[PDB]
Amino acid sequence: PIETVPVKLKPGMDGPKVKQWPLTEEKIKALVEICTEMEKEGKISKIGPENPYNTPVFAIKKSTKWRKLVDFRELNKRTQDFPHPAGLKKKKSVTVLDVGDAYFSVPLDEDFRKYTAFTIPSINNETPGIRYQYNVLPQGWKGSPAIFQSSMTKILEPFKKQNPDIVIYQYMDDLYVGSDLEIGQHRTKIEELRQHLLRWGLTTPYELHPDKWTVQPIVLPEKDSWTVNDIQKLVGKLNWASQIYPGIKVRQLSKLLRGTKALTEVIPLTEEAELELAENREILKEPVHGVYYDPSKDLIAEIQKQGQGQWTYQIYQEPFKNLKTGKYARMRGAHTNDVKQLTEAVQKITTESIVIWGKTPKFKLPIQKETWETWWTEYWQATWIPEWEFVNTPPLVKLWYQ
Amino acid sequence: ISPIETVPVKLKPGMDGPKVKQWPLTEEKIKALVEICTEMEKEGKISKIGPENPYNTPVFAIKKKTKWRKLVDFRELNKRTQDFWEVQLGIPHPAGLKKKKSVTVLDVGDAYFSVPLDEDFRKYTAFTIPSINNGIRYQYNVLPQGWKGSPAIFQSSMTKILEPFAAQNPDIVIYQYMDDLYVGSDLEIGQHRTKIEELRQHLLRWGLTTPDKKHQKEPPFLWMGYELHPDKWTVQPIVLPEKDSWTVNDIQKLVGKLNWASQIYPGIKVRQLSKLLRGTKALTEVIPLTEEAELELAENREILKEPVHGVYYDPSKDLIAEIQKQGQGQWTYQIYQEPFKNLKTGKYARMRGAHTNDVKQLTEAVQKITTESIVIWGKTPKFKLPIQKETWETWWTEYWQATWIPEWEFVNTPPLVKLWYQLEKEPIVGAETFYVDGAANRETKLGKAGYVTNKGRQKVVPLTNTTNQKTELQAIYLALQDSGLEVNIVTDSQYALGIIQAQPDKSESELVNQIIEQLIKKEKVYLAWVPAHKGIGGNEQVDKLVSAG
Ligand SMILES: Cc1c(Oc2ccccc2OCCn2ccc(=O)[nH]c2=O)cc(F)c2ccc(C#N)cc12
Numbered sequence: 008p009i010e011t012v013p014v015k016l017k018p019g020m021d022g023p024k025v026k027q028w029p030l031t032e033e034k035i036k037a038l039v040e041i042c043t044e045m046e047k048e049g050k051i052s053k054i055g056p057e058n059p060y061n062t063p064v065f066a067i068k069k070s071t072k073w074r075k076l077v078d079f080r081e082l083n084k085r086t087q088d089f090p091h092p093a094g095l096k097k098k099k100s101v102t103v104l105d106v107g108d109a110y111f112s113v114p115l116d117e118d119f120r121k122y123t124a125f126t127i128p129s130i131n132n133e134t135p136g137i138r139y140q141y142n143v144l145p146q147g148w149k150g151s152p153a154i155f156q157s158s159m160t161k162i163l164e165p166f167k168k169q170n171p172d173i174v175i176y177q178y179m180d181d182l183y184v185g186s187d188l189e190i191g192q193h194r195t196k197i198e199e200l201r202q203h204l205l206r207w208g209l210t211t212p213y214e215l216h217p218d219k220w221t222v223q224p225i226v227l228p229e230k231d232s233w234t235v236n237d238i239q240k241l242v243g244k245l246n247w248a249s250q251i252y253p254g255i256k257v258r259q260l261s262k263l264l265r266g267t268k269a270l271t272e273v274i275p276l277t278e279e280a281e282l283e284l285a286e287n288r289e290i291l292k293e294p295v296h297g298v299y300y301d302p303s304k305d306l307i308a309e310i311q312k313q314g315q316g317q318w319t320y321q322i323y324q325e326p327f328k329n330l331k332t333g334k335y336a337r338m339r340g341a342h343t344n345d346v347k348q349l350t351e352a353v354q355k356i357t358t359e360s361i362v363i364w365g366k367t368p369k370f371k372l373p374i375q376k377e378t379w380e381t382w383w384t385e386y387w388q389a390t391w392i393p394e395w396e397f398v399n400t401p402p403l404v405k406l407w408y409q
Numbered sequence: 410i411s412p413i414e415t416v417p418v419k420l421k422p423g424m425d426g427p428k429v430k431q432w433p434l435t436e437e438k439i440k441a442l443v444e445i446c447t448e449m450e451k452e453g454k455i456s457k458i459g460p461e462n463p464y465n466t467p468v469f470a471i472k473k474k475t476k477w478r479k480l481v482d483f484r485e486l487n488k489r490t491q492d493f494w495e496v497q498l499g500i501p502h503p504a505g506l507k508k509k510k511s512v513t514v515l516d517v518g519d520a521y522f523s524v525p526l527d528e529d530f531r532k533y534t535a536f537t538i539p540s541i542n543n544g545i546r547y548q549y550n551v552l553p554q555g556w557k558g559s560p561a562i563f564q565s566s567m568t569k570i571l572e573p574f575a576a577q578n579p580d581i582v583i584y585q586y587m588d589d590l591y592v593g594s595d596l597e598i599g600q601h602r603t604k605i606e607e608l609r610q611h612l613l614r615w616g617l618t619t620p621d622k623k624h625q626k627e628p629p630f631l632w633m634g635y636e637l638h639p640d641k642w643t644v645q646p647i648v649l650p651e652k653d654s655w656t657v658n659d660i661q662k663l664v665g666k667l668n669w670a671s672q673i674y675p676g677i678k679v680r681q682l683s684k685l686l687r688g689t690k691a692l693t694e695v696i697p698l699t700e701e702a703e704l705e706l707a708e709n710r711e712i713l714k715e716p717v718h719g720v721y722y723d724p725s726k727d728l729i730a731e732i733q734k735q736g737q738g739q740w741t742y743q744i745y746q747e748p749f750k751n752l753k754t755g756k757y758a759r760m761r762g763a764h765t766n767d768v769k770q771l772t773e774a775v776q777k778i779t780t781e782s783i784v785i786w787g788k789t790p791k792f793k794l795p796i797q798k799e800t801w802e803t804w805w806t807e808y809w810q811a812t813w814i815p816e817w818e819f820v821n822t823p824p825l826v827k828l829w830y831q832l833e834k835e836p837i838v839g840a841e842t843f844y845v846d847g848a849a850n851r852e853t854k855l856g857k858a859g860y861v862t863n864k865g866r867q868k869v870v871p872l873t874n875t876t877n878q879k880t881e882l883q884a885i886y887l888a889l890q891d892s893g894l895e896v897n898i899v900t901d902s903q904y905a906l907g908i909i910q911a912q913p914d915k916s917e918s919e920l921v922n923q924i925i926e927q928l929i930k931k932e933k934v935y936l937a938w939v940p941a942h943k944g945i946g947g948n949e950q951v952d953k954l955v956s957a958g
Pocket residue numbers: 501506507508509510512513514582583584591592593594626628630631632637638639640721
């Protein structure tokens with residue numbers, strides 16, 4: 008492994024200089040233990056003040072043992088050099104494997120190491136933070152799987168030879184393994200792959216079913232008795248859906264409210280209006296016409312809090328052109344909260360995004376910036392980190408995707 | 410003197426050293442510079458160099474009115490040198506300091522000049538002492554004062570130097586800040602003085618002098634706008650100027666000092682003054698003071714009339730935070746461990762939006778306190794809050810945005826944080842149904858707000874100098890005014906709907922405030938939305954009534 012791979016940055020671009028977030032004494036202590044041990048193993052080294060670069064670090068749990076997560080988003084943006092199977096989403100079962108440890112077998116380009124610099128913060132600015140840089144390929148850096156790619160192909164070659172119908176896609180520190188086998192057979196094959204990797208010195212210390220994923224069809228209410236207010240809600244919703252589905256009409260439904268009525272007045276569904284509603288229920292069954300994925304455009308994920316542990320989400324690239332929609336739910340158990348559910352939702356959506364298109368979406372999070380920045384690590388189990396921003400957009404979007 | 414290893418320094422890629430010519434100086438300054446530079450050359454701090462050094466940096470000598478000082482202008486060199494790991498900008502907060510029995514302040518004399526400078530970089534520090542006819546060439550061997558790399562490299566060097574002594578003395582706490590060391594311990598005063606002396610000699614072995622006498626600084630310590638006493642801390646005396654006219658700059662310094670005071674003086678209100686500062690024009694122009702700003706400043710003066718202090722931190726005791734309302738959108742808080750012994754205080758008066766409510770602002774205040782607590786103590790405090798579980802739970806449950814509420818105990822201390830009103834979730838039976846609409850001409854700015862009800866009541870009110878949004882709000886307001894205690898309201902305005910559904914209890918606009926007062930006076934209000942220009946029924950009548958005219 009003596010031969011390091013020369014890594015470059017995009018022309019006219021300097022290394023990352025991101026602020027290290029303040030941490031609790033617990034997390035700092037954990038990071039000090041972890042980095043002490045990593046230093047003893049030659050994985051990282053202490054650096055002097057001539058290194059101006061910096062990358063945020065966090066302590067998570069992923070087990071009871073603390074794990075160290077590095078936010079290489081900026082470095083990833085500033086460093087690039089060099090595929091995704093479309094059949095992965097078709098498979099019945101898909102299992103994710105952590106293969107990040109392998110990266111610590113390969114030395115990092117000496118001239119590039121300074122860009123991986125990070126800081127363990129002190130409490131109350133008592134001392135300057137403890138600064139390190141990486142000597143090996145660090146987890147979370149998009150350069151690591153790229154450099155290790157040949158070795159990975161080498162190790163996986165026999166298994167792929169044995170199992171031609173099994174799909175293996177790599178994203179960052181993760182291996183996605185998809186099969187159409189029965190669940191027991193699937194998990195057995197997964198374990199075989201695990202033991203193969205292990206016996207070839209690749210330590211691997213979460214299974215999905217994309218066969219059930221879909222774009223949620225818009226659902227219209229069903230009532231025994233309709234009030235004026237109900238018909239108003241229905242007409243508003245159908246009007247909203249008319250931007251996406253062209254054949255939707257509301258004339259016969261809105262006709263039932265002609266005049267100036269009290270909101271609570273009970274209105275009988277005439278034959279024509281019920282016909283129109285039925286037709287509108289039928290057109291909402293078929294998928295949208297002209298929506299296609301563009302690999303050159305950013306993926307955008309919006310999320311709405313629905314209450315009672317329910318969260319809706321949409322993935323699109325252009326407005327009103329949803330590539331995917333969904334609804335996430337969590338059993339309360341009194342141990343849950345908004346931040347936990349939102350974090351879990353973000354991770355699930357990101358996973359689905361990776362499986363389907365092979366990249367992470369840009370999130371619009373319905374939460375205050377500082378709150379998210381404070382508590383997002385508490386439930387974060389993934390090794391990757393998507394981009395995100397913070398928004399409002401409450402007013403009608405909730406009840407329509409509801 | 411090279412026991413201290415040097416930090417390798419490079420120029421920015423593609424840049425060469427500075428060649429700023431030496432400005433002509435008077436004979437006296439030349440003499441002073443010659444003597445000082447001979448004394449520094451004698452100490453090994455600088456060296457005379459050959460003729461083939463192409464680089465130059467202007468040098469000057471002055472004595473601020475007895476002693477002479479050499480100042481070097483390293484601006485060009487600094488612009489041409491690499492970046493370094495940013496030196497500590499943030500200072501420790503006094504409320505975070507753990508009470509020690511013994512405390513010592515060590516000032517390092519000639520800090521920068523005691524640390525060697527990277528060999529290959531010394532040629533770029535070249536400066537010239539002017540001859541009378543036309544000169545003597547010099548270069549630095551140590552960290553120059555005013556150079557870009559000096560603070561960080563001195564910092565690093567000091568850390569590495571301190572590592573062994575700290576290794577052999579884990580019972581001694583050493584803070585490092587600029588050219589100062591702050592040493593604390595719980596040993597007996599005598600053996601504490603002994604440990605201090607050991608540290609002094611150790612530093613002297615690396616070429617770092619410390620105060621030779623009984624250490625020059627004694628309690629209380631004046632430091633970065635703070636007074637550090639043995640058993641307490643406070644802020645240095647805040648003097649608020651009294652002027653007839655106020656400029657932007659004066660107001661900025663005023664809110665600056667008030668901000669500074671707020672960390673220990675409970676009750677400080679800066680909001681109206683910053684509202685005055687909303688004029689982000691030049692700092693020259695005169696800003697007329699609002700009555701609210703006058704009152705605010707007056708109250709601040711009344712608060713600053715009394716001396717206040719804070720206590721130090723004890724890791725064994727719990728961390729507790731309390732929050733009280735200060736009136737219109739302003740909040741104050743106290744962080745303590747002992748019930749009346751405050752670690753520190755603070756404020757929160759951000760709207761972050763045109764409209765909000767008490768519970769939202771309270772939650773935001775809690776957020777700010779949480780962040781600050783993590784920064785200062787490395788932990789989150791327990792919260793004693795003037796709000797009941799039913800209130801907050803209802804709010805965060807109905808709140809469309811995700812929020813994090815800590816474990817807290819309800820302290821009954823008026824004014825309590827409450828929901829002044831709650832919109833209905835279902836339409837109201839028996840209540841009159843107002844279909845409302847507002848319109849405005851986007852050119853003449855003229856408009857009108859109107860309603861039509863199911864009882865057959867219709868009305869239109871004229872409006873001058875307005876916009877469509879404000880007319881929609883105006884229409885909602887009109888429906889509130891002319892209705893009974895219960896009322897259903899239907900609008901086609903997503904804007905107005907969004908403003909009302911957020912359920913604010915305070916606003917920047919007086920119209921929204923009036924609407925709020927009305928909503929409070931009501932018993933049941935249900936707001937419904939319909940798409941405009943869809944001939945819904947009720948909405949079409951008010952549109953035809955008000956949209957065209
Ligand atoms: C003197 C001292 C400190 O002292 C401490 C040094 C090391 C560890 C713990 C300390 O303080 C705990 C709190 N405290 C404080 C003052 C006192 O008199 N007694 C105390 O118990 C800590 C600081 F940030 C100082 C910052 C600037 C200056 C100056 N000039 C002196 C400081």
